[PDB]
Amino acid sequence: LGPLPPGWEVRSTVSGRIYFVDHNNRTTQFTDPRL
Amino acid sequence: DTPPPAYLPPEDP
């Protein structure tokens, strides 16, 4: 709904699914904060 | 979609 945290890599696939792969804290999430 | 995979560095055009 707003901000994107630094360290967040957006690993996207053509299916239309963005899925989070943060290289810093090492975390994975389907909820994208930019939306 | 299903539960999220492990983390990789991204392929994004």
Swiss-Prot record, chain A:
**Tissue expression as described in the entry:** Expressed in melanocytes.
Subcellular location field: Cytoplasm; Cell membrane
Q: How is it modified after translation?
A: Auto-ubiquitinated in presence of NDFIP1.
**Domain WW positions:** 2-35
Summarizing the function annotation, the protein's role is: E3 ubiquitin-protein ligase that acts as a negative regulator of BMP signaling pathway. Mediates ubiquitination and degradation of SMAD1 and SMAD5, 2 receptor-regulated SMADs specific for the BMP pathway. Promotes ubiquitination and subsequent proteasomal degradation of TRAF family members and RHOA. Promotes ubiquitination and subsequent proteasomal degradation of MAVS. Acts as an antagonist of TGF-beta signaling by ubiquitinating TGFBR1 and targeting it for degradation. Plays a role in dendrite formation by melanocytes.
What does the annotation say about its assembly with partners?
Answer: Interacts with TRAF4. Interacts (via HECT domain) with FBXL15 (via LRR repeats). Interacts with SMAD7 and TGFBR1; SMAD7 recruits SMURF1 to TGFBR1 and regulates TGF-beta receptor degradation. Interacts with MAVS; the interaction is mediated by NDFIP1.
- Free-text note on domains in this protein's UniProt record: The C2 domain mediates membrane localization and substrate selection.
- This chain's protein is named E3 ubiquitin-protein ligase SMURF1
What's the source species for this entry?
A: Homo sapiens (Human)
Q: Which residues of the full protein are shown?
A: 305 to 339 of 757
From Swiss-Prot, chain B:
Q: Where are the transmembrane segments?
A: none
Q: Where in the cell is it found?
A: Cytoplasm; Nucleus
Tissue spec. comment: Ubiquitous. Highest expression seen in the heart and skeletal muscle.
Extent of Pro residues compositional bias: 1-12
Please outline how this chain is modified post-translation: Phosphorylation of the C-terminal SVS motif by BMP type 1 receptor kinase activates SMAD1 by promoting dissociation from the receptor and trimerization with SMAD4. Phosphorylation by ERK2 MAP kinase in response to EGF or HGF prevents SMAD1 nuclear accumulation and transcriptional activity in response to BMP. Dephosphorylation, probably by PPM1A, induces its export from the nucleus to the cytoplasm. Dephosphorylation is inhibited by association with EGR1. Ubiquitinated by SMAD-specific E3 ubiquitin ligase SMURF1, leading to its degradation. Monoubiquitinated, leading to prevent DNA-binding. Deubiquitination by USP15 alleviates inhibition and promotes activation of TGF-beta target genes. Dephosphorylation, probably by PPM1A, induces its export from the nucleus to the cytoplasm. Phospho-SMAD1 is ubiquitinated by CHIP leading to disruption of the SMAD1-SMAD4 complex.
Per the record, what about its domains?
Answer: The MH2 domain mediates phosphorylation-dependent trimerization through L3 loop binding of phosphoserines in the adjacent subunit.
This chain's function reads: Transcriptional modulator that plays a role in various cellular processes, including embryonic development, cell differentiation, and tissue homeostasis. Upon BMP ligand binding to their receptors at the cell surface, is phosphorylated by activated type I BMP receptors (BMPRIs) and associates with SMAD4 to form a heteromeric complex which translocates into the nucleus acting as transcription factor. In turn, the hetero-trimeric complex recognizes cis-regulatory elements containing Smad Binding Elements (SBEs) to modulate the outcome of the signaling network.
Q: Oligomeric state and partners?
A: Found in a complex with SMAD4 and YY1. Interacts with HGS, NANOG and ZCCHC12. Upon C-terminus phosphorylation: forms trimers with another SMAD1 and the co-SMAD SMAD4. Interacts with PEBP2-alpha subunit, CREB-binding protein (CBP), p300, SMURF1, SMURF2, USP15 and HOXC8. Associates with ZNF423 or ZNF521 in response to BMP2 leading to activate transcription of BMP target genes. Interacts with SKOR1. Interacts (via MH2 domain) with LEMD3. Binding to LEMD3 results in at least a partial reduction of receptor-mediated phosphorylation.
Concerning its family, UniProt says:
Belongs to the dwarfin/SMAD family.
Name of this protein: Mothers against decapentaplegic homolog 1
